[PDB]
Design a protein around this ligand. Structure first.
Ligand SMILES: COc1ccccc1CC(=O)N1CC[C@H](C(N)=O)C1
Ligand SMILES: [Zn+2]
Length: 140
């Protein structure tokens, strides 16, 4: 689990969104596994606006923050799970690192701020849903 709180927005994995998030929906995309809902309080996270390919992510299944090199956002085949059938997920970045299903929501960050959240993994890989192209997260 986990979320990004920027301005009056909450960014979560679409598959983990709550009733309140769907009721206060701003934008969602099943193909990206992302959902953004509105909040009443101001968040404190800053979204990175960059092309960084190195960063640090939080892995809840190890209580550890791991430095990683990750690929640029791309369309990647993702195996079937309890939440989606096997499909291509877009804007996904992969890295070699540990992840378990409940690690989704862990933040990946670089020197410029939040890059994305854990969204996929298995077999020694970890995949992150990119948020850096969502420019509107920084305004209104
Ligand atoms: C971090 O993900 C994993 C880690 C180890 C094993 C399996 C997984 C994948 C997983 O369970 N899901 C849920 C839905 C999500 C998606 N974005 O399609 C992927
Ligand atoms: Zn960066």
């Amino acid at each position: 689990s986990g979320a990004i709180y920027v301005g009056n927005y909450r960014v979560v994995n679409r598959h983990l969104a709550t009733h309140n998030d769907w009721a206060n929906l701003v934008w969602e995309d099943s193909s990206r596994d992302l959902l953004v809902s509105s909040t009443t309080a101001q968040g404190c996270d800053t979204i990175a606006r960059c092309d960084c390919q190195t960063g640090v992510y939080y892995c809840s299944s190890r209580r550890k923050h791991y430095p990683v090199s990750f690929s640029k956002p791309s369309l990647i085949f993702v195996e079937a799970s309890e939440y989606y059938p096997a499909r291509y997920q877009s804007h996904l970045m992969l890295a070699v690192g540990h992840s378990e299903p409940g690690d989704c929501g862990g933040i990946l960050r670089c020197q410029h701020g939040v890059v994305g959240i854990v969204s996929t993994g298995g077999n020694g890989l970890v995949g992150f849903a990119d948020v850096r192209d969502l420019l509107w997260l920084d305004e209104e």
